[PDB]
Scaffold this active site. Structure first.
Site, short mmCIF file in Angstrom:
data_model
loop_
_atom_site.label_atom_id
_atom_site.label_comp_id
_atom_site.label_asym_id
_atom_site.label_seq_id
_atom_site.Cartn_x
_atom_site.Cartn_y
_atom_site.Cartn_z
N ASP A 1 3.06 22.79 -24.55
CA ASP A 1 4.13 23.59 -24.78
C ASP A 1 3.61 24.13 -26.08
O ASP A 1 4.63 24.59 -27.07
CB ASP A 1 5.23 22.84 -24.93
CG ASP A 1 6.68 23.58 -24.96
OD1 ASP A 1 6.47 24.83 -24.22
OD2 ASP A 1 7.73 23.54 -25.48
N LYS B 1 0.36 29.75 -25.47
CA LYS B 1 0.00 29.86 -23.89
C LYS B 1 -1.56 29.98 -23.79
O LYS B 1 -1.93 29.47 -22.82
CB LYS B 1 0.87 30.73 -23.37
CG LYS B 1 2.44 30.66 -23.49
CD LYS B 1 2.71 29.13 -23.54
CE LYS B 1 4.19 28.96 -23.93
NZ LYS B 1 4.60 27.54 -24.43
N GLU C 1 14.66 28.36 -21.32
CA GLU C 1 15.41 27.68 -22.20
C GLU C 1 16.63 28.94 -22.35
O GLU C 1 16.30 30.02 -23.01
CB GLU C 1 14.84 27.18 -23.25
CG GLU C 1 13.94 28.11 -24.12
CD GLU C 1 12.42 27.95 -23.70
OE1 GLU C 1 12.30 27.76 -22.43
OE2 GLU C 1 11.52 28.14 -24.72
N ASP D 1 4.92 23.17 -19.74
CA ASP D 1 6.01 24.26 -19.78
C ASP D 1 5.64 25.68 -19.65
O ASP D 1 4.28 25.98 -19.84
CB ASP D 1 6.63 24.18 -21.15
CG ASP D 1 8.15 24.78 -21.16
OD1 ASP D 1 8.67 24.90 -20.23
OD2 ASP D 1 8.41 25.32 -22.25
N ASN D 2 6.52 26.54 -19.21
CA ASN D 2 6.31 27.89 -19.37
C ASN D 2 5.15 28.70 -18.34
O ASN D 2 4.71 29.67 -18.61
CB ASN D 2 6.04 28.35 -20.88
CG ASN D 2 7.04 28.34 -21.81
OD1 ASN D 2 6.79 27.32 -22.81
ND2 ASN D 2 8.33 28.63 -21.49
C1 LIG Z 1 7.54 26.24 -27.96
S1 LIG Z 1 7.20 25.47 -29.55
C2 LIG Z 1 7.43 23.84 -28.93
C3 LIG Z 1 8.72 23.48 -28.67
C4 LIG Z 1 8.93 21.71 -28.11
N1 LIG Z 1 7.80 21.46 -27.51
C5 LIG Z 1 10.35 21.72 -27.87
O1 LIG Z 1 10.47 21.87 -26.64
O2 LIG Z 1 11.21 21.21 -28.29
C6 LIG Z 1 5.35 25.91 -29.95
C7 LIG Z 1 4.85 25.15 -31.25
O3 LIG Z 1 3.52 24.89 -31.09
C8 LIG Z 1 3.03 24.90 -32.27
N2 LIG Z 1 1.57 25.51 -32.14
C9 LIG Z 1 1.15 26.52 -31.40
N3 LIG Z 1 -0.24 26.30 -31.49
C10 LIG Z 1 -0.75 25.19 -31.78
C11 LIG Z 1 -1.88 24.55 -31.98
N4 LIG Z 1 -2.91 25.08 -31.46
N5 LIG Z 1 -1.84 23.28 -32.42
C12 LIG Z 1 -0.68 22.48 -32.67
N6 LIG Z 1 0.65 23.45 -32.88
C13 LIG Z 1 0.46 24.56 -31.94
C14 LIG Z 1 3.80 26.39 -33.08
O4 LIG Z 1 3.64 25.96 -34.53
C15 LIG Z 1 5.15 26.02 -32.31
O5 LIG Z 1 6.04 24.96 -33.25
C1 LIG Z 2 12.72 34.78 -24.38
C2 LIG Z 2 11.79 35.65 -23.23
C3 LIG Z 2 12.43 36.37 -22.54
CL1 LIG Z 2 14.10 36.61 -22.40
C4 LIG Z 2 11.65 37.14 -21.71
C5 LIG Z 2 12.37 38.25 -20.55
N1 LIG Z 2 10.35 37.22 -21.54
O1 LIG Z 2 9.68 38.07 -20.55
C6 LIG Z 2 9.78 36.26 -22.31
CL2 LIG Z 2 8.16 36.29 -22.31
C7 LIG Z 2 10.57 35.58 -23.34
C8 LIG Z 2 9.72 34.64 -24.28
N2 LIG Z 2 8.90 34.96 -25.20
O2 LIG Z 2 8.45 33.76 -25.81
C9 LIG Z 2 9.02 32.77 -25.02
C10 LIG Z 2 8.69 31.16 -24.89
C11 LIG Z 2 9.20 30.20 -24.46
C12 LIG Z 2 8.81 28.92 -24.46
O3 LIG Z 2 9.46 27.62 -23.84
C13 LIG Z 2 7.57 28.74 -25.48
O4 LIG Z 2 7.12 27.41 -25.54
C14 LIG Z 2 6.97 29.77 -26.05
N3 LIG Z 2 6.05 29.65 -26.87
O5 LIG Z 2 5.31 30.64 -27.35
O6 LIG Z 2 5.40 28.36 -27.11
C15 LIG Z 2 7.50 31.11 -25.92
N4 LIG Z 2 9.90 33.21 -24.03
CL LIG Z 3 19.32 25.19 -21.16
MG LIG Z 4 8.27 26.24 -23.90
#
Ligand SMILES: C[S@@+](CC[C@H](N)C(=O)[O-])C[C@H]1O[C@@H](n2cnc3c(N)ncnc32)[C@H](O)[C@@H]1O
Ligand SMILES: Cc1c(Cl)c(C)[n+]([O-])c(Cl)c1-c1noc(-c2cc(O)c(O)c([N+](=O)[O-])c2)n1
Ligand SMILES: [Cl-]
Ligand SMILES: [Mg+2]
Ligand code: NA
Length: 217
Positions: free
Chosen positions: A142, A145, A200, A170-171
């Protein structure tokens, strides 16, 4: 940190509304705040329930999480781990890691989860010899991407997966991980399952991929 952030407001909301030592109330508080006030990239309640089902099915003894953010998914997985089971979560953002530690303390899961400070592409090859990991039982992907595929490959190349290790990503639809999907779905070293869900806090369709490693070729 240099001021008020979304992540600090999430943590303050937990500290003002949730019950210490009650992971469920921590998750409800974060989900309530991010539904009502500020969207955030926590895995969220709908996808969290798929995550819950995976944890209960496989009872992993050692879980690696890539991307901690504010600690929502760490709290969400760690609360269901069996006694003695452990979660490692990797986070490169020190400000996020500090929030995550506070979330773990508040939820009472600080003794089951360890934050590894750094980037997954640097830490994964060091897990065996610097963090004493043999093999991982489950991995939750997560983070950014574009790292899903090379880090999955890294998990394989470093011998950190064993037969039956669970990858949960995820995602895979939104924002989307088409290269990760094509790799795991096309390799006989993985058995895949796609879980329909929602992004989410939104009604955009998203999904998780469960990819169970089958052992080397
Ligand atoms: C979507 S958030 C994770 C959310 C969490 N898993 C949750 O559901 O509560 C993505 C996180 O990954 C960290 N991140 C992005 N690339 C990373 C990497 N290569 N190594 C460690 N952390 C990374 C970012 O700082 C960010 O906090
Ligand atoms: C909020 C949103 C909406 Cl409303 C629409 C229509 N679209 O197309 C997109 Cl792409 C997004 C969107 N941008 O970023 C994320 C996201 C979600 C994650 O769960 C996650 O883990 C990470 N991340 O970067 O780690 C990024 N979602
Ligand atoms: Cl939710
Ligand atoms: Mg995610
Ligand atoms: Na324990």
């Amino acid at each position: 940190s240099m001021g008020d952030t979304k992540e600090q407001r999430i943590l303050r909301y937990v500290q003002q509304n949730a019950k210490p030592g009650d992971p469920q109330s921590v998750l409800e508080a974060i989900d309530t705040y991010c539904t009502q006030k500020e969207w955030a990239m926590n895995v969220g309640d709908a996808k969290g329930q798929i995550m819950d089902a995976v944890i209960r099915e496989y009872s992993p003894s050692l879980v690696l999480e890539l991307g901690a953010y504010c600690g929502y998914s760490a709290v969400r997985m760690a609360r269901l781990l069996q006694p003695g089971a452990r979660l490692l979560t990797m986070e490169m953002n020190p400000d996020y890691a500090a929030i995550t530690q506070q979330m773990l303390n508040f939820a009472g899961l600080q003794d089951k989860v360890t934050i590894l400070n750094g980037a997954s592409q640097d830490l994964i090859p060091q897990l065996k010899k610097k963090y004493d990991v043999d093999t991982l039982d489950m991995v939750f992907l997560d983070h950014w991407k574009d790292r899903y595929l090379p880090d999955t490959l890294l998990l394989e190349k470093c011998g950190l997966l064993r037969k039956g290790t669970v990858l949960l990503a995820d995602n895979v639809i939104v924002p989307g991980t088409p290269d990760f999907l094509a790799y795991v779905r096309g390799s006989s070293s993985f058995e895949c399952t796609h879980y329909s869900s929602y992004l989410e806090y939104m009604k955009v369709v998203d999904g998780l991929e469960k990819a169970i490693y089958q052992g080397p070729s």
